[PDB]
PDB file of C-alpha atoms in Angstrom:
ATOM      1  CA  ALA A 801     -13.245   5.447  -2.488  1.00 13.50           C
ATOM      2  CA  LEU A 802     -12.305   3.988   0.751  1.00 11.31           C
ATOM      3  CA  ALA A 803      -9.407   5.969   0.937  1.00 12.01           C
ATOM      4  CA  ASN A 804     -11.528   9.369   0.005  1.00 11.11           C
ATOM      5  CA  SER A 805     -13.860   9.073   3.146  1.00 12.43           C
ATOM      6  CA  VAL A 806     -10.703   9.278   5.617  1.00 13.29           C
ATOM      7  CA  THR A 807     -10.776  12.558   7.832  1.00 16.42           C
ATOM      8  CA  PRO A 808      -8.162  13.814   9.971  1.00 19.26           C
ATOM      9  CA  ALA A 809      -8.274  12.035  13.233  1.00 18.92           C
ATOM     10  CA  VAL A 810      -8.930  13.933  16.630  1.00 19.46           C
ATOM     11  CA  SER A 811      -5.608  13.270  18.622  1.00 18.16           C
ATOM     12  CA  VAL A 812      -5.445  14.481  22.049  1.00 20.25           C
ATOM     13  CA  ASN A 813      -2.100  15.487  23.800  1.00 21.75           C
ATOM     14  CA  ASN A 814      -0.403  13.869  20.884  1.00 21.86           C
ATOM     15  CA  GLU A 815      -1.827  10.354  22.099  1.00 22.22           C
ATOM     16  CA  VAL A 816       0.129   7.325  20.544  1.00 23.28           C
ATOM     17  CA  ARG A 817      -2.160   5.989  17.551  1.00 21.77           C
ATOM     18  CA  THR A 818      -2.568   2.076  18.975  1.00 20.18           C
ATOM     19  CA  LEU A 819      -5.187  -0.373  18.332  1.00 19.93           C
ATOM     20  CA  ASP A 820      -7.435   0.394  20.971  1.00 19.20           C
ATOM     21  CA  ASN A 821      -8.029   4.382  20.234  1.00 22.78           C
ATOM     22  CA  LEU A 822      -8.586   3.633  16.823  1.00 21.47           C
ATOM     23  CA  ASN A 823     -11.699   5.595  15.094  1.00 21.84           C
ATOM     24  CA  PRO A 824     -14.885   2.882  14.666  1.00 23.66           C
ATOM     25  CA  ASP A 825     -15.379   4.344  11.260  1.00 26.96           C
ATOM     26  CA  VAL A 826     -11.564   3.703  10.406  1.00 24.37           C
ATOM     27  CA  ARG A 827     -11.685   0.123  11.939  1.00 28.54           C
ATOM     28  CA  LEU A 828     -13.770  -1.157   9.148  1.00 30.80           C
ATOM     29  CA  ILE A 829     -11.709   0.528   6.293  1.00 31.69           C
ATOM     30  CA  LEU A 830      -8.346  -0.826   7.807  1.00 31.02           C
ATOM     31  CA  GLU A 831     -10.295  -4.299   7.819  1.00 35.06           C
ATOM     32  CA  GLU A 832     -11.068  -4.124   4.146  1.00 30.91           C
ATOM     33  CA  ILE A 833      -7.859  -2.939   2.871  1.00 34.01           C
ATOM     34  CA  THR A 834      -6.011  -5.668   5.052  1.00 37.81           C
ATOM     35  CA  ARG A 835      -8.327  -8.208   3.409  1.00 36.72           C
ATOM     36  CA  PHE A 836      -7.978  -6.806  -0.023  1.00 37.77           C
ATOM     37  CA  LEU A 837      -3.886  -6.425   0.456  1.00 41.94           C
ATOM     38  CA  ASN A 838      -3.853 -10.202   1.772  1.00 38.81           C
ATOM     39  CA  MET A 839      -6.281 -11.580  -1.172  1.00 37.99           C
ATOM     40  CA  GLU A 840      -3.720  -9.902  -3.549  1.00 37.41           C
ATOM     41  CA  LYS A 841      -0.880 -11.762  -1.908  1.00 35.14           C
ATOM     42  CA  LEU A 842      -2.872 -15.307  -2.571  1.00 36.81           C
ATOM     43  CA  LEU A 843      -4.835 -14.095  -6.095  1.00 38.71           C
ATOM     44  CA  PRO A 844      -2.971 -11.496  -7.813  1.00 35.89           C
ATOM     45  CA  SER A 845      -4.786  -8.753  -9.829  1.00 36.28           C
ATOM     46  CA  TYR A 846      -3.472  -7.602 -13.366  1.00 34.31           C
ATOM     47  CA  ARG A 847      -1.035  -5.380 -12.798  1.00 33.31           C
ATOM     48  CA  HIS A 848      -1.369  -5.633  -8.929  1.00 32.53           C
ATOM     49  CA  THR A 849      -3.624  -2.569  -9.079  1.00 32.77           C
ATOM     50  CA  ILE A 850      -5.077  -3.359  -6.007  1.00 34.03           C
ATOM     51  CA  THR A 851      -1.968  -3.639  -4.399  1.00 33.65           C
ATOM     52  CA  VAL A 852      -1.300  -0.081  -5.618  1.00 34.42           C
ATOM     53  CA  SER A 853      -4.619   1.306  -4.285  1.00 29.89           C
ATOM     54  CA  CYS A 854      -3.915  -0.478  -0.942  1.00 29.88           C
ATOM     55  CA  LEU A 855      -0.558   1.040  -0.253  1.00 28.03           C
ATOM     56  CA  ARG A 856      -1.828   4.318  -1.354  1.00 31.40           C
ATOM     57  CA  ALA A 857      -4.852   3.738   1.011  1.00 33.43           C
ATOM     58  CA  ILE A 858      -2.347   3.058   3.993  1.00 34.20           C
ATOM     59  CA  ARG A 859      -0.439   6.164   3.171  1.00 37.66           C
ATOM     60  CA  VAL A 860      -3.910   8.166   3.468  1.00 38.01           C
ATOM     61  CA  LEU A 861      -4.292   6.583   6.928  1.00 39.32           C
ATOM     62  CA  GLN A 862      -0.924   7.476   7.813  1.00 42.66           C
ATOM     63  CA  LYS A 863      -0.979  11.128   6.870  1.00 44.37           C
ATOM     64  CA  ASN A 864      -4.010  11.389   8.994  1.00 44.17           C
ATOM     65  CA  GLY A 865      -3.512  10.157  12.814  1.00 44.53           C
ATOM     66  CA  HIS A 866      -4.940   6.760  12.450  1.00 47.06           C
ATOM     67  CA  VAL A 867      -2.391   4.424  11.360  1.00 48.19           C
ATOM     68  CA  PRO A 868       1.427   4.891  13.241  1.00 50.54           C
ATOM     69  CA  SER A 869       3.724   6.803  10.357  1.00 49.96           C
ATOM     70  CA  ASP A 870       6.130   3.857   9.731  1.00 47.88           C
ATOM     71  CA  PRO A 871       7.769   3.731   6.296  1.00 45.82           C
ATOM     72  CA  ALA A 872       8.687   0.187   6.776  1.00 46.25           C
ATOM     73  CA  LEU A 873       6.033  -1.544   5.057  1.00 48.47           C
ATOM     74  CA  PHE A 874       6.379   0.838   2.053  1.00 48.30           C
ATOM     75  CA  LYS A 875      10.385   0.207   2.758  1.00 51.73           C
ATOM     76  CA  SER A 876       9.640  -3.509   1.873  1.00 56.83           C
ATOM     77  CA  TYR A 877       7.332  -3.152  -0.998  1.00 56.08           C
ATOM     78  CA  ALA A 878      10.250  -0.858  -2.619  1.00 56.18           C
ATOM     79  CA  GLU A 879      12.549  -3.470  -3.044  1.00 57.43           C
ATOM     80  CA  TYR A 880      13.833  -5.012  -6.516  1.00 58.76           C
ATOM     81  CA  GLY A 881      12.223  -7.929  -7.105  1.00 59.32           C
ATOM     82  CA  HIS A 882       8.553  -6.368  -6.925  1.00 57.54           C
ATOM     83  CA  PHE A 883       6.417  -5.233  -9.424  1.00 55.08           C
ATOM     84  CA  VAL A 884       7.238  -2.031 -10.787  1.00 54.06           C
ATOM     85  CA  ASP A 885       3.661  -0.294 -10.217  1.00 56.38           C
ATOM     86  CA  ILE A 886       4.087  -1.532  -6.716  1.00 56.06           C
ATOM     87  CA  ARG A 887       7.630  -0.199  -6.533  1.00 52.67           C
ATOM     88  CA  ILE A 888       6.804   3.253  -7.566  1.00 53.42           C
ATOM     89  CA  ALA A 889       3.627   3.393  -5.188  1.00 51.27           C
ATOM     90  CA  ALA A 890       5.858   2.382  -2.397  1.00 55.65           C
ATOM     91  CA  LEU A 891       8.579   4.909  -3.154  1.00 54.60           C
ATOM     92  CA  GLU A 892       5.728   7.816  -3.611  1.00 58.32           C
ATOM     93  CA  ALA A 893       4.576   6.796  -0.055  1.00 53.62           C
ATOM     94  CA  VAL A 894       8.251   6.966   1.140  1.00 53.92           C
ATOM     95  CA  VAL A 895       8.762  10.500  -0.419  1.00 58.80           C
ATOM     96  CA  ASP A 896       5.566  11.612   1.060  1.00 56.71           C
ATOM     97  CA  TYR A 897       6.703  10.206   4.357  1.00 59.18           C
ATOM     98  CA  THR A 898      10.469  11.833   4.226  1.00 62.55           C
ATOM     99  CA  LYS A 899       8.532  15.250   3.241  1.00 65.05           C
ATOM    100  CA  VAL A 900       6.059  15.191   6.355  1.00 64.38           C
ATOM    101  CA  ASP A 901       8.251  13.747   8.975  1.00 63.33           C
ATOM    102  CA  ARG A 902      11.396  15.391   7.784  1.00 63.02           C
ATOM    103  CA  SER A 903      13.408  12.327   7.906  1.00 63.04           C
ATOM    104  CA  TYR A 904      17.219  12.193   7.327  1.00 63.86           C
ATOM    105  CA  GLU A 905      17.450   8.425   7.075  1.00 67.81           C
ATOM    106  CA  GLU A 906      14.648   8.024   4.499  1.00 67.92           C
ATOM    107  CA  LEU A 907      16.173  11.089   2.487  1.00 69.72           C
ATOM    108  CA  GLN A 908      19.432   8.864   2.380  1.00 66.98           C
ATOM    109  CA  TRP A 909      17.737   5.692   1.540  1.00 60.97           C
ATOM    110  CA  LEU A 910      15.959   7.558  -1.547  1.00 63.23           C
ATOM    111  CA  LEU A 911      19.367   9.022  -2.965  1.00 65.06           C
ATOM    112  CA  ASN A 912      21.039   5.697  -1.991  1.00 63.85           C
ATOM    113  CA  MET A 913      18.321   4.166  -4.061  1.00 63.27           C
ATOM    114  CA  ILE A 914      18.823   6.918  -6.939  1.00 60.73           C
ATOM    115  CA  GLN A 915      22.378   5.794  -7.204  1.00 59.58           C
ATOM    116  CA  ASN A 916      22.518   2.159  -7.384  1.00 55.57           C
ATOM    117  CA  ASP A 917      19.090   0.855  -8.263  1.00 55.86           C
ATOM    118  CA  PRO A 918      19.410  -1.983 -11.292  1.00 53.13           C
ATOM    119  CA  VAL A 919      15.868  -0.442 -13.326  1.00 51.93           C
ATOM    120  CA  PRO A 920      16.914   3.289 -14.535  1.00 50.57           C
ATOM    121  CA  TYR A 921      13.215   3.834 -14.953  1.00 50.94           C
ATOM    122  CA  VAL A 922      12.692   3.476 -11.229  1.00 50.27           C
ATOM    123  CA  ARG A 923      15.740   5.773 -10.473  1.00 49.23           C
ATOM    124  CA  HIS A 924      14.368   8.463 -12.786  1.00 46.11           C
ATOM    125  CA  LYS A 925      10.863   8.292 -11.067  1.00 48.42           C
ATOM    126  CA  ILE A 926      12.143   8.686  -7.601  1.00 49.52           C
ATOM    127  CA  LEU A 927      14.049  11.606  -8.907  1.00 48.53           C
ATOM    128  CA  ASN A 928      10.983  12.821 -10.634  1.00 48.10           C
ATOM    129  CA  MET A 929       8.816  12.173  -7.369  1.00 44.54           C
ATOM    130  CA  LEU A 930      11.269  14.007  -5.406  1.00 45.97           C
ATOM    131  CA  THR A 931      11.139  17.047  -7.493  1.00 46.64           C
ATOM    132  CA  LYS A 932       6.938  17.079  -7.517  1.00 45.62           C
ATOM    133  CA  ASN A 933       7.010  16.549  -3.790  1.00 42.88           C
ATOM    134  CA  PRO A 934      10.191  18.201  -2.459  1.00 43.92           C
ATOM    135  CA  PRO A 935      11.509  17.337   1.144  1.00 45.32           C
ATOM    136  CA  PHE A 936      11.865  20.986   1.461  1.00 44.59           C
ATOM    137  CA  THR A 937      11.950  24.103  -0.922  1.00 42.05           C
ATOM    138  CA  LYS A 938      14.204  27.104  -1.077  1.00 40.43           C
ATOM    139  CA  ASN A 939      11.843  29.263   1.256  1.00 39.84           C
ATOM    140  CA  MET A 940      11.854  26.386   4.100  1.00 38.86           C
ATOM    141  CA  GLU A 941      14.229  26.419   6.902  1.00 40.35           C
ATOM    142  CA  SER A 942      14.891  22.542   7.293  1.00 42.04           C
ATOM    143  CA  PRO A 943      16.995  20.382   9.517  1.00 36.76           C
ATOM    144  CA  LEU A 944      17.665  18.867   6.225  1.00 34.53           C
ATOM    145  CA  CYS A 945      19.744  21.768   4.737  1.00 33.31           C
ATOM    146  CA  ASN A 946      23.125  20.744   5.609  1.00 32.18           C
ATOM    147  CA  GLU A 947      26.273  21.524   3.750  1.00 33.00           C
ATOM    148  CA  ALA A 948      26.409  17.383   3.541  1.00 35.09           C
ATOM    149  CA  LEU A 949      23.236  17.641   1.440  1.00 35.52           C
ATOM    150  CA  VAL A 950      24.251  20.152  -0.918  1.00 38.21           C
ATOM    151  CA  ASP A 951      27.598  18.347  -1.542  1.00 38.71           C
ATOM    152  CA  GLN A 952      25.949  15.058  -2.152  1.00 40.36           C
ATOM    153  CA  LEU A 953      23.340  16.393  -4.541  1.00 39.35           C
ATOM    154  CA  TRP A 954      26.277  18.506  -6.294  1.00 41.25           C
ATOM    155  CA  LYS A 955      28.619  15.215  -6.237  1.00 42.92           C
ATOM    156  CA  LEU A 956      25.049  13.515  -7.960  1.00 42.23           C
ATOM    157  CA  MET A 957      24.942  16.188 -10.598  1.00 45.22           C
ATOM    158  CA  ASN A 958      28.672  16.271 -11.406  1.00 43.72           C
ATOM    159  CA  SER A 959      29.322  12.405 -11.221  1.00 40.19           C
ATOM    160  CA  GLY A 960      27.048   9.634 -10.195  1.00 42.06           C
ATOM    161  CA  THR A 961      24.548  10.429 -12.876  1.00 39.58           C
ATOM    162  CA  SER A 962      26.980  10.671 -15.638  1.00 36.38           C
ATOM    163  CA  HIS A 963      25.560   7.337 -17.506  1.00 36.16           C
ATOM    164  CA  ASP A 964      21.897   8.373 -18.358  1.00 34.84           C
ATOM    165  CA  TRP A 965      21.585  11.858 -19.335  1.00 33.30           C
ATOM    166  CA  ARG A 966      17.992  11.684 -17.694  1.00 34.53           C
ATOM    167  CA  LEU A 967      18.996  11.021 -14.285  1.00 35.23           C
ATOM    168  CA  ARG A 968      21.572  14.237 -14.565  1.00 33.30           C
ATOM    169  CA  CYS A 969      18.734  16.171 -16.069  1.00 36.95           C
ATOM    170  CA  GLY A 970      16.471  15.128 -13.180  1.00 37.05           C
ATOM    171  CA  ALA A 971      19.347  15.689 -10.439  1.00 40.89           C
ATOM    172  CA  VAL A 972      19.496  19.179 -12.079  1.00 41.21           C
ATOM    173  CA  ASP A 973      15.736  19.586 -11.477  1.00 42.64           C
ATOM    174  CA  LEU A 974      16.051  18.227  -7.908  1.00 41.14           C
ATOM    175  CA  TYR A 975      18.911  20.500  -7.294  1.00 42.67           C
ATOM    176  CA  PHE A 976      16.973  23.602  -8.594  1.00 43.50           C
ATOM    177  CA  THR A 977      14.024  22.642  -6.691  1.00 44.84           C
ATOM    178  CA  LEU A 978      15.856  22.588  -3.605  1.00 45.29           C
ATOM    179  CA  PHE A 979      18.101  25.336  -3.370  1.00 41.86           C
ATOM    180  CA  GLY A 980      17.409  27.575  -6.439  1.00 44.79           C
ATOM    181  CA  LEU A 981      19.293  29.085  -9.451  1.00 42.75           C
ATOM    182  CA  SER A 982      21.919  30.924  -6.635  1.00 43.81           C
ATOM    183  CA  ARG A 983      24.259  29.703  -4.259  1.00 44.96           C
ATOM    184  CA  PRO A 984      22.810  27.356  -1.845  1.00 42.05           C
ATOM    185  CA  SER A 985      21.856  29.615   1.072  1.00 39.32           C
ATOM    186  CA  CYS A 986      22.350  26.906   4.225  1.00 36.08           C
ATOM    187  CA  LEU A 987      26.055  27.096   3.381  1.00 37.12           C
ATOM    188  CA  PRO A 988      28.971  29.003   4.805  1.00 36.20           C
TER     189      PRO A 988
ATOM    190  CA  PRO B 156     -57.639 -37.567   5.880  1.00 39.30           C
ATOM    191  CA  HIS B 157     -55.005 -38.370   8.342  1.00 40.70           C
ATOM    192  CA  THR B 158     -56.540 -41.450   9.246  1.00 41.15           C
ATOM    193  CA  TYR B 159     -55.869 -42.607   5.560  1.00 38.33           C
ATOM    194  CA  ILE B 160     -54.488 -39.292   3.540  1.00 41.30           C
ATOM    195  CA  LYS B 161     -50.929 -39.637   3.197  1.00 44.30           C
ATOM    196  CA  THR B 162     -49.983 -36.905   1.061  1.00 45.26           C
ATOM    197  CA  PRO B 163     -46.227 -35.909   1.385  1.00 41.85           C
ATOM    198  CA  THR B 164     -44.598 -32.594   2.776  1.00 42.01           C
ATOM    199  CA  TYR B 165     -41.317 -31.086   1.877  1.00 45.60           C
ATOM    200  CA  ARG B 166     -38.817 -28.398   3.554  1.00 44.74           C
ATOM    201  CA  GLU B 167     -39.755 -24.660   3.258  1.00 44.86           C
ATOM    202  CA  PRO B 168     -37.460 -23.528   0.086  1.00 47.35           C
ATOM    203  CA  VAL B 169     -35.840 -19.967   0.701  1.00 47.42           C
ATOM    204  CA  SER B 170     -36.072 -18.621  -2.998  1.00 50.00           C
ATOM    205  CA  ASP B 171     -35.421 -14.806  -1.902  1.00 48.94           C
ATOM    206  CA  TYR B 172     -32.684 -13.017  -4.206  1.00 47.96           C
ATOM    207  CA  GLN B 173     -32.203 -10.794  -1.332  1.00 46.25           C
ATOM    208  CA  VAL B 174     -31.186 -13.405   1.389  1.00 50.41           C
ATOM    209  CA  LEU B 175     -29.402 -15.489  -1.326  1.00 50.74           C
ATOM    210  CA  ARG B 176     -27.166 -12.416  -2.057  1.00 48.03           C
ATOM    211  CA  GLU B 177     -26.644 -12.306   1.542  1.00 48.03           C
ATOM    212  CA  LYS B 178     -25.718 -15.663   2.069  1.00 48.88           C
ATOM    213  CA  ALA B 179     -23.340 -15.784  -0.875  1.00 49.80           C
ATOM    214  CA  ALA B 180     -21.768 -12.675  -0.049  1.00 48.76           C
ATOM    215  CA  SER B 181     -21.343 -13.435   3.749  1.00 46.39           C
ATOM    216  CA  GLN B 182     -19.911 -16.933   2.950  1.00 44.07           C
ATOM    217  CA  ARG B 183     -17.477 -15.336   0.434  1.00 44.57           C
ATOM    218  CA  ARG B 184     -16.392 -12.964   3.019  1.00 45.88           C
ATOM    219  CA  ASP B 185     -16.090 -15.437   5.680  1.00 44.41           C
ATOM    220  CA  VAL B 186     -14.074 -17.911   3.556  1.00 41.25           C
ATOM    221  CA  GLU B 187     -11.826 -15.265   2.419  1.00 43.78           C
ATOM    222  CA  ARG B 188     -10.923 -13.946   5.864  1.00 46.91           C
ATOM    223  CA  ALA B 189     -10.410 -17.330   7.315  1.00 45.03           C
ATOM    224  CA  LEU B 190      -8.051 -18.258   4.463  1.00 42.54           C
ATOM    225  CA  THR B 191      -6.030 -14.820   4.688  1.00 43.31           C
ATOM    226  CA  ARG B 192      -5.694 -15.133   8.477  1.00 41.11           C
ATOM    227  CA  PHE B 193      -4.759 -18.715   8.090  1.00 38.52           C
ATOM    228  CA  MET B 194      -2.031 -17.701   5.626  1.00 39.72           C
ATOM    229  CA  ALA B 195      -0.402 -14.863   7.597  1.00 41.65           C
ATOM    230  CA  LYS B 196      -0.344 -16.751  10.631  1.00 43.43           C
ATOM    231  CA  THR B 197       1.676 -19.448   9.049  1.00 42.71           C
ATOM    232  CA  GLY B 198       4.270 -17.334   7.441  1.00 39.45           C
ATOM    233  CA  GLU B 199       6.134 -14.019   7.891  1.00 36.38           C
ATOM    234  CA  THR B 200       3.832 -11.275   8.736  1.00 37.25           C
ATOM    235  CA  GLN B 201       3.811  -7.528   8.617  1.00 36.14           C
ATOM    236  CA  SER B 202       1.622  -5.064  10.761  1.00 41.71           C
ATOM    237  CA  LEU B 203       0.584  -1.790  10.435  1.00 42.83           C
ATOM    238  CA  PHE B 204       0.711  -1.545  14.304  1.00 42.64           C
ATOM    239  CA  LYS B 205       3.629  -2.207  16.476  1.00 41.11           C
ATOM    240  CA  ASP B 206       3.436  -6.030  17.504  1.00 39.97           C
ATOM    241  CA  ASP B 207      -0.150  -6.214  15.888  1.00 39.98           C
TER     242      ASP B 207
END
């Protein structure tokens, strides 16, 4: 409910979002989610439901112009040793970031995590979230439409996902969502 | 009665549900804020803002 109340901020001349030019409304929300996340670090919930809700709310505040658009927090919560709900919430935030900020290195981070993660459910979920919220569609001109990305995703369909039968269908779905049924257009 | 009356008095008791809810709420919020700031200062820390 605190995350639902966040309206987009009135940035002037692309002013850098710092602590002093914060909204007086959002400072209370940010204090509350900081208190909740820190108290979850000491007294945890049943399935880290407050971690998932606070990561989702930090991504809501980053989607508007309130918190700086930095994926390092979600990249630290998406490591292997965390609970799987925290991991998929953080990876959902990283997928949303690499859709909005057109990040090349975050997409390479996600594709590397698809290739070598210990939990295969997390790999399937990353392919699923990158299909649902794709970094670009076939209609879009994007900077992330290289021949290098077409070769990486074709290598991920062909080899690489040969051991799961669910990662390979997810890679086929991702290639269909990104490049369509015909020849990838962004190619010689 | 004053020259001789010696009837004891007590302190004013605050039996009000509103101010008791406010006191317990604010004391819980303050102790959890103090605890989380102490634990974030004496360990590894992250920040939503640059150098915060």
